[PDB]
């Protein structure tokens, strides 16, 4: 399924602009969007392995990929978790399923968000990446209201060859990222 908007958006729009705002030499130097990850701090899905699959399967739809599992390792004595049996929910998508996800992001999810104001332009890893936070997971399209037994939250990320948050900012902006200015 190699065909979408955000695809050629980076190609015939962002790419050239990245040659403008900064300018380069080699094609393999211009910041390429390549890695996107998700995560869900599931200390909640400890007691309930049932509620665990629910979050995973829900995720499966909104991501268009295959959910994964990543428990803890240390030992939160304060909050009931130890060995690392409980759970954490992770899922990394790339190539096409990546582009298809971001499309839904800035055209579906972000749009109908509780008093949406944009993306905080500070959430850069000091280098050339970005990390955002979300609550209600139902802001995604396919997620029906009468199906969510909990407004489980989650946070994602996106890696790019970008080395500076200025290049990153420009990139993301050109990609179509409404940054709360």
């Amino acid at each position: 399924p190699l065909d979408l908007a955000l695809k050629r958006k980076y190609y015939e729009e962002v790419r050239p602009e990245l040659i403008r705002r900064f300018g380069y030499q080699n094609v393999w130097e211009v910041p390429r969007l390549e890695k996107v990850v998700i995560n869900q701090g599931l200390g909640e899905a400890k007691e309930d392995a049932r509620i665990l699959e629910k979050a995973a399967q829900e995720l499966a739809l909104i991501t268009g990929q295959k959910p994964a599992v990543t428990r803890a390792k240390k030992s939160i004595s304060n909050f009931k978790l130890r060995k690392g049996m409980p759970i954490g929910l992770r899922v990394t998508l790339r190539r096409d399923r990546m582009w298809i996800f971001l499309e839904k992001l800035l055209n579906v999810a972000l749009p109908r968000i509780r008093d949406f104001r944009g993306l905080n332009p500070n959430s850069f890893d000091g280098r050339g990446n970005y990390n955002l936070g979300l609550r209600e997971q139902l802001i995604f399209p396919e997620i029906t209201y009468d199906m969510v037994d909990a407004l489980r939250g989650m946070d994602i990320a996106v890696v790019t060859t970008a080395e500076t948050d200025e290049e990153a900012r420009a990139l993301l902006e050109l990609l179509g990222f409404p940054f709360r200015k």
């Binding site: 979408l4 739809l61 268009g64 298809i100 055209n107 579906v108 749009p111 109908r112 399209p141």
Partner: peptide
């Protein structure tokens, strides 16, 4: 399959998701 976002404000994108009949609203068109 081509997810036809039928958002209620005048935008129908052909993304890729489950059930092309994805009824939404308040997207990027409004």
């Amino acid at each position: 399959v081509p997810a036809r976002i039928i958002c209620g404000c005048g935008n129908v994108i052909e993304t890729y998701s489950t059930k092309p009949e994805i009824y939404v609203e308040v997207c990027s068109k409004c």
